[PDB]
Symmetry: C2
Subunit: 201 residues, 2 copies
């Protein structure tokens, strides 16, 4: 019904008008987006709202991503926390006894980190990438709900992003999300027929 309607108006936006994007709207969209579930409720994410370093950042984008990042009034660099033990502890420290029982606090302070310590490098890397996908989706929908266009960009030079945006190396860049109002009518892109991608077991 109404969620279908939201989805039909989300498009990959590549050309933006000059209309200003209100930081109150960006903050709201991000606050809705983080209601997203995450494995362990680890919420291992950091949103870097770029309004000043856009031209610099754009030099890291490949092909036509260069023009998208240069023009977009806002780009949100989505980072994930590669120190999953510190991320669990952060949740315990910030939430505290006002949000958590003693059992829950021990879990985030000690149990969970002990679990994370036994993850392979691929397990960690997949975990962060997956949780970034969950929240990135919620974010673009939240923007769309406010009438704001966006595009998720993976074609950029991840190795320079921390340096350019002055973010601790503990955080790795996952995605750039350009944010702005759209200067062109767009058509829905192709999706496989649903019965093509469903299996019954």
């Amino acid at each position: 019904m109404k969620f279908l309607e939201l989805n039909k108006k989300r498009h990959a936006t590549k050309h933006f008008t000059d209309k200003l994007v209100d930081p109150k709207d960006v903050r709201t969209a991000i606050e809705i987006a983080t209601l997203a579930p995450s494995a362990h409720n680890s919420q291992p994410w950091k949103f870097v709202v770029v309004r000043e370093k856009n031209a610099e950042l754009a030099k890291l984008a490949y092909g036509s991503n260069f023009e998208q990042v240069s023009s977009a009034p806002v780009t949100i660099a989505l980072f994930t926390d590669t120190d999953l033990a510190k991320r669990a502890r952060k949740i315990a420290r910030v939430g505290g006894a006002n949000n958590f029982s003693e059992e829950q606090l021990q879990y985030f302070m000690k149990n969970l980190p002990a679990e994370f310590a036994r993850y392979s490098e691929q397990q960690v890397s997949d975990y962060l990438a997956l949780n970034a996908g969950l929240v990135a989706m919620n974010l673009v929908l939240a923007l769309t709900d406010q009438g704001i266009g966006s595009n998720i960009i993976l074609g950029f030079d991840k190795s320079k992003v921390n340096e350019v945006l002055e973010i601790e190396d503990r955080f790795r860049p996952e995605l750039l999300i350009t944010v702005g109002y759209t200067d062109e009518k767009l058509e829905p892109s192709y999706r496989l027929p649903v019965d093509e991608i469903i299996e019954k077991r």
Copy 2:
């Protein structure tokens, strides 16, 4: 009213006996896959488990065992580890009816070439992220239909293909239990927004 939809999505762990209509599951999946994906590669497979649940449940760790046993449906979400094959599938199925000359060549030639250059980790991260995008959309789609869900990462990935009889080309990403909920759930904790935002 997206804020409101989000506020009614919860991690649901105990379900009522109300049946889950296969039509609703199909519809939620159809909406979910409106999700964007990198390159529009849409590298997903949704395995709707209605008959093999008890056996699937043995692969799920700790408290997840009971969720997978109890849920009237679990959707096992797989990604396509053969991305060149996925690109060419899109081109085959979509065809001339959906794609221009240039678009067809992009999916049959250019895209598989790009995929060939990715490291093993890059490929793993690509499938994981795309799974997260669509899993989020599925879970909201279900919510919008009054249906509860929980995403489960705590399961034995090495045995899911054998148990569910799914070709090894596809790798299990997540189990998503689906059913109507039997308890008042309160929202779980989220960090204050100004704690997860930097300005640059």
